[PDB]
Amino acid sequence: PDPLQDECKAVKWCALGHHERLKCDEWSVTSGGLIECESAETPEDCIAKIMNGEADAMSLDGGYVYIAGQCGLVPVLAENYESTDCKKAPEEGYLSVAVVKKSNPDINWNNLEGKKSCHTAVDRTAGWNIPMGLLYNRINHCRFDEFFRQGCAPGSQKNSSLCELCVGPSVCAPNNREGYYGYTGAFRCLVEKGDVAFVKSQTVLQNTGGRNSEPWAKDLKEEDFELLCLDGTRKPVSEAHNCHLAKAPNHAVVSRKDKAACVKQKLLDLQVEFGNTVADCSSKFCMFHSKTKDLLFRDDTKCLVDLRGKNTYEKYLGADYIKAVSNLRKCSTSRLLEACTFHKH
Amino acid sequence: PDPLQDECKAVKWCALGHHERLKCDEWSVTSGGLIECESAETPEDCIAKIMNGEADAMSLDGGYVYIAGQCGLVPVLAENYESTDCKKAPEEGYLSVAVVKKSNPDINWNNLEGKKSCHTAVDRTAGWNIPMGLLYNRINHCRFDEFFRQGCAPGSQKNSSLCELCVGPSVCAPNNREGYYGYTGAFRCLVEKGDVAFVKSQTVLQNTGGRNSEPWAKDLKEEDFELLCLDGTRKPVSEAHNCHLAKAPNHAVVSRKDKAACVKQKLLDLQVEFGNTVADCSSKFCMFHSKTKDLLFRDDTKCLVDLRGKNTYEKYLGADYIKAVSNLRKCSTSRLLEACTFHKH
Amino acid sequence: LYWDDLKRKLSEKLDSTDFTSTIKLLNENSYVPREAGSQKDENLALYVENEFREFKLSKVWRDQHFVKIQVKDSAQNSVIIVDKNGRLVYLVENPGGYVAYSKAATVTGKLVHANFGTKKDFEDLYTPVNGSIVIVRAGKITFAEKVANAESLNAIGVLIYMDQTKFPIVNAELSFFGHAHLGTGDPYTPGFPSFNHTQFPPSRSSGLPNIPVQTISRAAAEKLFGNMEGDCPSDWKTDSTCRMVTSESKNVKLTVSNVLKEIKILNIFGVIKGFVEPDHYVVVGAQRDAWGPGAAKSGVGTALLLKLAQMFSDMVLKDGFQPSRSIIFASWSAGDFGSVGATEWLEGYLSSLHLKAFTYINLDKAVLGTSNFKVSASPLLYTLIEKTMQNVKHPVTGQFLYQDSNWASKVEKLTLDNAAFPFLAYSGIPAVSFCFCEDTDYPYLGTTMDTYKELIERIPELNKVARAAAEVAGQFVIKLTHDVELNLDYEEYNSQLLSFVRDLNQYRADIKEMGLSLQWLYSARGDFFRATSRLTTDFGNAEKTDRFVMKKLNDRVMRVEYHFLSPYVSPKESPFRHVFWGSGSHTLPALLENLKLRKQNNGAFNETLFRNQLALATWTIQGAANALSGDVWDIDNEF
Amino acid sequence: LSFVRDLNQYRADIKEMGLSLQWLYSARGDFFRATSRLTTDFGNAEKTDRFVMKKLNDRVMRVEYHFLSPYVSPKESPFRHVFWGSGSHTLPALLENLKLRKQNNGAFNETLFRNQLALATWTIQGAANALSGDVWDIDNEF
Amino acid sequence: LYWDDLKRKLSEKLDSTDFTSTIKLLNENSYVPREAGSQKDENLALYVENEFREFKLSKVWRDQHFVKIQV
Amino acid sequence: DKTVRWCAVSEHEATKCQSFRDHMKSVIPSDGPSVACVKKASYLDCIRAIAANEADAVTLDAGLVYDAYLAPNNLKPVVAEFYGSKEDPQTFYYAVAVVKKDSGFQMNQLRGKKSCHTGLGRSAGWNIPIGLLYCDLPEPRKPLEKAVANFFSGSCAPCADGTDFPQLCQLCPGCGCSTLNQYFGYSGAFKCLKDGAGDVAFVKHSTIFENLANKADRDQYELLCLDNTRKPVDEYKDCHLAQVPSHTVVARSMGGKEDLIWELLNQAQEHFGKDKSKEFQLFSSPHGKDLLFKDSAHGFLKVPPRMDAKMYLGYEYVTAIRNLREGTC
Ligand SMILES: [Fe+3]
Ligand SMILES: [Fe+3]
Ligand SMILES: [Fe+3]
């Protein structure tokens, strides 16, 4: 590395499963190789690839951003959902709610013990960290798979209760090959087998009113669902604002310190030709648009915004979130996190 | 080998080079698998195969019969050349002569030192043992490749003088892939490059008078050649009887003691349908007839006759022959013979 | 442990295993009409899958596939006697079963009776089939072939029935299921695997009939003959009742309406990782689907597959058995349609399976009687079959399977209708396939009568018999793994090759009229012999301790079988490339078969075809040699 | 990947035709893993176990050869290499035919493409199953 | 030995080898119009063959072939 | 219940192993785990033996843990040593470079000096210091052994090939890979310096305290810090080359008896850990230092389920090892 210059030739992206891979390839061709694609079957494996430079960048939910940070990666750019003005600071975060069927008269916050649950995935913010930590502070033990009777929390142990509702070909995988994986998957899970789904507040709207055209969701109505409020009551979905579990930091892009800058710049640039601005997404390529749901980025992603000094995972996620995930540390089952916390320096 | 019976299902024959192999195959098919074919590139290798039961039988010139015997094989049946009555005892042997061109006025028995020689192969009776041993008793050393100036004695060291006249694709091999190999090859060698050929007495006749139709021999005349008599004179070829080096035991079939009987019986039987009796050899199969020259048996072979008690190589070859080959023991270069004489019992 | 140990252990384990129970269990209504790609099918599939898991054996997975199968359309298929107009008598019958992949059509005309599906041979009879429906007995050959020949002679429609002599079934109102595909597996994915129907959906005729084929009940056959003038010959090792041709006064009309139906085949695997060459397997398969309850066609097999997998896993964990090479059991599906399941799997490793699987055993139809013990395999497994038949004692007779009076045992060639055939003729994997067969083939075989009852009613000690079958199958596995040296008879091919050269020399005359030298062939045959002689030597000089030098040799052995597949013909065109056991003009036998025609002085002999046949068949063998060693760079530079 | 990319520029045409083009990605991936294992097994193996190394180098030695279409006869089309060969089996040849689709004329042989893609897929697929995946590639789901 | 060694060695060996001479030698009328399957051809062939033998390298052989050329 | 076949490297370890076997017999019930001892000549033979089912366990320095993980061995770490105190267990230690007082050279002036290493491929004795000097080595740097042999003017690098790299065994002829070589290991590498055979010893922060009881004897030595200064030996926390992971016991990936290994060691530390018994000590011996386990260990911790060597060692350390092996400057 004598007086050298320019390692920022191309950015290698880490993609889960098949679909994210396809989307990445497409993004590759069209960029003229500014974006390179590596793949893995799990989020943790993707973070590992980036740790050891087998890849450079991926976008992640806050919960996984925590793991990534304990493993030495840094946040580079945040996903902003509220505005199309990409110069805005990162939002304070999205709303995390608990959703049930209006059909079901008895379920409430203080009633979960025994019911059937649906989660985006283990270790995600809205699907796990927020709700599980708030329940933990109530039951003061960690056998969540004994609190709920049954569930689908992708990334859980293949043979616990919490995998009994899953379906996707790869049963219970923390990726798209599990049907009930993600914000959408957890909603469907609710529609079809669970009593409660833990997801983001915009989820019901994005999947009712024919906005989602899959057989299972085409005729669904926003009015068929309610939210669980912490105080025990129930409210319409249009009331998340006054009936949510907590705020959740936006998903963020991570890399290694060595390559953060490179990564930034190429993303900010690529956004100029492939972000919100693209009027039609079936003609030209769209980063924030996904053939399926939420590939590489959240489909409701508007802008990738600079972090304005919150260049550290403790800084970006914020105290409150850190404090909450830490309280749940004792229940982790993340093999990558134990790995990243072995060395004593 | 509890009280068992009948190992004489089929006899496996060892064949040199390509041609002998072809002939063997042909003999196989037609027998309905009574004869099986194994192959090797040298006589010694064939004897080795039989020693260690990789094959069972092959026919051999007296010189090689000696080696075979020192290596523990036994003679089973002899090739008879003089009569078609296969119940006759084995002949006393064929005549071994030295032949030159009438063209050449100066060569004689007492003149060989310096000339160019042609030999059937090293270790054969007419091509080597008889003539070399009789010369040895004169020069009392073993550098025959320094007595003759140059030669073709197949089976000799690739880079001695004695390989300098050879031609066959495989230069100097002790098989058919050397052109100047055998009774015929040595004659041609004489015709084309040598001054003396050591062969059997019937050789000139079998290859002159259009009896041999190859380009090199079609116009040759018996009268173009003479024999060297031990007393220094020269005589026409029709005079071998009074102008030969010595008698040579007939070629004989060898096997191991275990399988001698089997071998005999199947040969005697096969002779009934495939020996002299076959009126036409292009229609039906003939043992003693060869596409080329002398494959598996000598083409002048008439009968395979029982040995009448000479079931031992010392017994069959006879004292005189043994005494002669022994005197040459010190010049052997046979790797198989040293092998067979290593053990001290 | 040593062989005796494994032999002794495997025996007592076999001494305490109820095969009859499982053969029955695989008969409960839970999975009885387990047709290909049916629910029952899928039921047993998951049963096996779990059982394997329960057996605690290593990795075990599923193999999904979407192939086009043919089924009986809602419209009824039927045979009816009718003159040059309308049906006078009655609709012979509305067949209860059908011949898959049969041409979906309907035609009428004369009705000839060519004993035993023409056999291709039998077609050389008096009455011509030049444009007329034909009747044939189920026997010597496969429907596929029966039909194929019929059509090759320009016939139309073919009826297959089970006569009384050949099929001593009391009930004559019984109907059976057919195949009709002159190949193996889905008839639209030759050499390459299949997809959806939505994607790559060709119709057919890609090696399929193009002539309606219908299975007929003996009763129906009776009636047909009833309306026939001709008289059945004694040459036909049959018995009275049948005719040769329908009575001129009138003819018959065949109407078959069948439809294709995309189903989802499910192959179930499960291996037992080895300890030294963990990546060299011994595929042990067994058809799992069936038309009727197929207790024989599919029961005994899967029964053995399971019980047999149950043992080895156990032996490995509890008894200390350390297979040097991994074992991989597999229960195929959609087998009634040409091993569609197993074949499309192979289709998947078109050029690497041989690098993985070194032998394929097959348990299908393992127990069908107690008289004979037929055995079909690749010469490479000849000595194993032999030495094993010398270790296994007949279930009924207290004596050993091997006939001590011979030195040359009888081994049969694999037929187009045996899952083992594809493994050997297409994937180049040596394969064995035993059968406690009978002089007469099981009758209830392709019919709804293949029940566990009528079976055991016809084979009282079915348990002991199945046990034996499970034993010879077991030893094969122990043997193909126990030792470090891969024990395959690569020598037997020298003979197999010489035999060819011999038979070919019987035409040296014809070979001469043509400028052909036929010299290059001997060279190959020889260039190959040496190759084997070195391998056969290198082994002896190598130590069963140098995992490296041994691996380098065993791999050479593992190449032998595969390399006899003509590398000059495309799998997509002619899937069975094996010059010795395949099918096509590349076939070694096919060469002579064309040359024989030379003498007939007619045009039947295609000279240009021969010229190549020989030419390539030579380089095929030649290559087989250069690939089997010769220390690499074979130096027979002279010639 | 470059191939897959250039091929996605016709995803439109690929769509007019019932083609799913999904099996190709699977192969391309089923192959990627294959190389990732090999690339791993090497690191974990010691340059002292002549055996485990030989078993690996052999796999590497298969890589190039296995990209030769095992569905075309050498006697007919000798340059079988899907990447550098010459013939309709050629990977480049596939796109080259598809390009003609847009020309709305008959220049595009659809049946030819269908196969081209179909086989070119299994060619790649096979290349994968041959390059390891620890043998018996277990992506049994799909 | 290590790469550097082999690299360094191979270099000095390359530092002392007259390629120009041999490029010329292969121009003497002994083998000039060395057309395919010509005598000159066969001449140089045997030259290389022997040179290899002279180089004292291990096995060295010939590869015969009869192809149809156009003239 | 059942037997754990411990792999002992050479005589001294073999002696301690047999005493370990005997003492556990006297305290463990008939239904508890027991030890059997298998003696080999080197750690590498212990690694093969475990893979071949000839033994079950052996404790290795973390740099050797990487090698043990590689095929065809595939051993995994199951129990880790910890240092410090039972009160604040440390699962790491410090690699230091010890030299004599006033010898007058800094870390940037090592070329031409004589070095004492604990053993080829070990964390403190080799991986860390050679990793730090790598680009100061002359090309060609492959093979590593040769560049190292040309940088220093003689070394003792136990386990290295003295036939191929004679300068590496110049201070300990033969490069013996066990305690029969008096300059082997932490204490042997220190003895190599103290005896005056070498100028620097690449050891751990506790080595000198385990070897010199008097502060006045210890005042004769110093540490080389990375900033090209020197500090006293008490000041290792601010003058060390790196922090490295603890030594760990490894076992087979299949039929490995990891449960029994933990069971045996957990009981062993309870009966025979620091200050527990007057009869036998797991972490010391009259027969030698660091036999079977390091004398500086205070106990054991069970490694988390199915953790592989790479995860155990951590990205950093694994990266360093890799970069030594191919490595580009
Ligand atoms: Fe989220
Ligand atoms: Fe003679
Ligand atoms: Fe250490």
From Swiss-Prot, chain D:
Q: Which residues constitute the signal peptide according to the record?
A: none
Induction: what does the entry report? Answer: Regulated by cellular iron levels through binding of the iron regulatory proteins, IRP1 and IRP2, to iron-responsive elements in the 3'-UTR. Up-regulated upon mitogenic stimulation.
Please describe the post-translational modifications of this protein.
Stearoylated by ZDHHC6 which inhibits TFRC-mediated activation of the JNK pathway and promotes mitochondrial fragmentation. Stearoylation does not affect iron uptake. N- and O-glycosylated, phosphorylated and palmitoylated. The serum form is only glycosylated.
Region feature (Ligand-binding) = 1-142
Effect ascribed to mutating residue 32 to Q: >5-fold reduced affinity for transferrin. >10-fold reduced affinity for HFE
- Listed result of changing residue 28 to K: 5% binding to transferrin
Q: Where are the glycosylation sites?
A: 109
**Where is this protein localized, as stated in its record?**
Cell membrane; Melanosome
Position of motif Cell attachment site? 28-30
Q: What else is known?
A: Serum transferrin receptor (sTfR) is used as a means of detecting erythropoietin (EPO) misuse by athletes and as a diagnostic test for anemia resulting from a number of conditions including rheumatoid arthritis, pregnancy, irritable bowel syndrome and in HIV patients. Canine and feline parvoviruses bind human and feline transferrin receptors and use these receptors to enter and infect cells.
Quote the subunit structure annotation.
Answer: Homodimer; disulfide-linked. Binds one transferrin or HFE molecule per subunit. Binds the HLA class II histocompatibility antigen, DR1. Interacts with SH3BP3. Interacts with STEAP3; facilitates TFRC endocytosis in erythroid precursor cells. Interacts with GRM2.
Illness association:
Immunodeficiency 46: An autosomal recessive primary immunodeficiency disorder characterized by early-onset chronic diarrhea, recurrent infections, hypo- or agammaglobulinemia, normal lymphocyte counts, intermittent neutropenia, and intermittent thrombocytopenia.
By sequence similarity, the record places it as follows: Belongs to the peptidase M28 family. M28B subfamily.
Q: What does this protein do?
A: Cellular uptake of iron occurs via receptor-mediated endocytosis of ligand-occupied transferrin receptor into specialized endosomes. Endosomal acidification leads to iron release. The apotransferrin-receptor complex is then recycled to the cell surface with a return to neutral pH and the concomitant loss of affinity of apotransferrin for its receptor. Transferrin receptor is necessary for development of erythrocytes and the nervous system. A second ligand, the hereditary hemochromatosis protein HFE, competes for binding with transferrin for an overlapping C-terminal binding site.
Protein name as it appears in the record: Transferrin receptor protein 1
What organism is recorded for this protein?
Homo sapiens (Human)
> What is the organism lineage in this UniProt record?
Eukaryota, Metazoa, Chordata, Craniata, Vertebrata
Which residues of the parent protein does this chain contain? 619 to 760 of 760
Swiss-Prot record, chain F:
- Specify the effect of residue 298 to R: In allele TF*CHI
Residues modified as Dimethylated arginine are: 21
| Compartments where located | Secreted
Q: Which residues are glycosylated?
A: 30
Sequence positions that bind Fe(3+) 1:
61, 93, 186, 247
* Taxonomic superkingdom: Eukaryota
Which part of the chain is the Transferrin-like domain? Answer: 4-326
- Which residues are listed for hydrogencarbonate 1 binding in this entry? 118, 122, 124-125
UniProt lists the family membership as follows:
Belongs to the transferrin family.
What binding partners and quaternary form does the record give? Monomer. Part of a complex composed of SLC40A1/ferroportin, TF/transferrin and HEPH/hephaestin that transfers iron from cells to transferrin. (Microbial infection) Binds to Neisseria transferrin-binding protein A (tbpA or tbp1). Forms a large complex with TbpA and TbpB.
Entry text on domains: Has a bilobed structure, each lobe binds a single Fe(3+) ion. Does not always bind 2 Fe(3+) ions.
Q: List the protein's name.
A: Serotransferrin
Gene that this polypeptide is encoded by: TF
